[model samples]
Target: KIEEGKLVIWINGDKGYNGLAEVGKKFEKDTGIKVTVEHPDKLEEKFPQVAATGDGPDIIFWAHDRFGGYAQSGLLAEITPDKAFQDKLYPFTWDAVRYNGKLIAYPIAVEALSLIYNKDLLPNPPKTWEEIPALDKELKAKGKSALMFNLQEPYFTWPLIAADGGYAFKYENGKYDIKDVGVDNAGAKAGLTFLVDLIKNKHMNADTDYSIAEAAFNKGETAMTINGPWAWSNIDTSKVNYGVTVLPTFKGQPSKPFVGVLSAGINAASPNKELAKEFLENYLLTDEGLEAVNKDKPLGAVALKSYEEELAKDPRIAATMENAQKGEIMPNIPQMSAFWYAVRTAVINAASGRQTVDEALKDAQTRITK
Candidate 1:
């Protein structure tokens, strides 16, 4: 039951629509198969329900995280990009799209958290968590703080806490071992301690949240802050000289951010499976495909290795890619729902003085394990 002359795609938002609309037009021109891309609201909720009945889009554009659950629920078709194409992308990009040792999507872009600094205030950013106190001493005289970030957000704080071998779930053999949670390990305890120490020593505000921290950085009241590549969209970059760099080390180990990949996958029930594959392989996975998409919204870190040299010229892209390449791909399993709540609650409790770092993490580990 093939659609005679068209392909359809369901994407998440205006950003995704604008980025891929050009590619869809070009794809239509090249193949004479009309390509339609729609940004539907509540896509994550609606997609599975619609797709399960075999009446949705040929392709679903989304972050790689949800594909694992989709593939597990039998909503996604197993796919294999050409072996040559597989070799062209970063090795880890494939990891994000795979679930149960099978490829479920084609990765298009990647991003990770970074330590962004106001260069006019702190020319040299801290290289290690241990250096923050000394940096704070220097910055205080100038009416600025060294760094500020949301204390309760695990996504923003995981890099520092995971530096010494802590992880939400152990990734092994191309799948996550959810049974092996590490939130209460020594590395995690030390990392959490480092965060509480920042507050205890007066280097950071005890009440700082994402809004407060971002506002301070945007106003040049903070020398550095933690954020992802999309950081510029919220702040006027021209108002301050800025630098994007890898996060400072913790306990002599590089802090590792969580890497997220945006990808496209064929709906299992789509009647146009072959056409979808052709579009992705011939028209959507090439240099032209990515370049056209990025022209509308700069994809901070493209997944292709061939474009590495050219993309690296932009420091923001370079720094984000560097962090991504060094970072762990976020776990995509359903268990991550539990992991997120556990870590967020633990961080909040420890940062607010309601619990010690050990108490908080022990509670987190117990909750996640159960």
Candidate 2:
């Protein structure tokens, strides 16, 4: 355990550096604990190098996906929340921190996919995938682009497939059973069929890139797109009215967008574990602490109670919170690294009309199972 008034911490570059610094300064004034903070460039290169030598930072703020690799390799501390703390956290946020039944990190914020559309063009968003194709035809008849999506990209389609009750992996007995991958399930096939029909009917453009999609929607060339709140600020809504909604349901199942939680984890090898833990417990978990961070970066809070209060005040935030209820956390299994690559290949092939929906899913299951 760490003694009072001394702590050392580490975070990522730029954002991590400044964010931690602000928290540290405030924490020291509040609790009289002196905190030493450091930020290293090229974390992708340096983190592994330091962890290999059994000398790493007390706390690290990075993507949750990387925790699986480190935890599986025995390089990260297995965090266990006190029953009180566990009960206090949002269920979805708490789930994101768990790997193989052990908590590996503490979540701070959540990001999930949503439906953002021009209100002027779409007075009411479609309620289901079955409705979207017809809506597309209606828009085309009026000489407007109904929707735009990336045919070669899988991120946009994954949520739609999940909405239709499809899954890339099977979960049973509290463990992920990759043996019976669900990429070829009936729901996935039906979802892909809808996507194909959209392409065949020219409802969506096959060549749209991130920049192209953003520009088209901002310029009013397209009415809607599936994206996250990170893009909300960059969009030009001054020239047009816009609204956000939870992604449409499929066969009565709500769209399950992939939810990503940003968190901080203590490195097992850090010489300052006690200090880092103290810093996180006091500064990162407190309302004042969360407020400070949110002031600089306006992201949804990790605590459901706090976020719910925020949502009640902002409709856009409310929509994101509502969509998050239907969100699924990305798997942190080590094999998930390869699973994502295979799934992306399958989705791209099917969307481009190079493979039938069933054929694409069959290939995905094979690759994932391997």
Q: Give me the candidate number with maximum lDDT.
A: 1
- Which one is best on TM-score? 1
TM-score of 1: 0.91
Clashing pairs in 1: none
Q: In model 1, which regions exceed 4 Å deviation?
A: 1-3, 236-240, 251-254
Q: Model 2, range 95-133, lDDT digits (tens) per residue?
A: 667778878777676677777788988889888767887
Look at candidate 1 and tell me the lDDT of residue 75: 64
What does the lDDT come to for candidate 2?
Answer: 0.69
Query: lDDT by residue for model 1 over 201-273, one digit each (tens)?
Result: 7777866677777777777887788787766635654445787888776665646788888767787777778
- In candidate 2, the residue pairs with backbone N, CA or C atoms under 3 Å apart (3 or more residues apart, or in different chains) clash, namely none
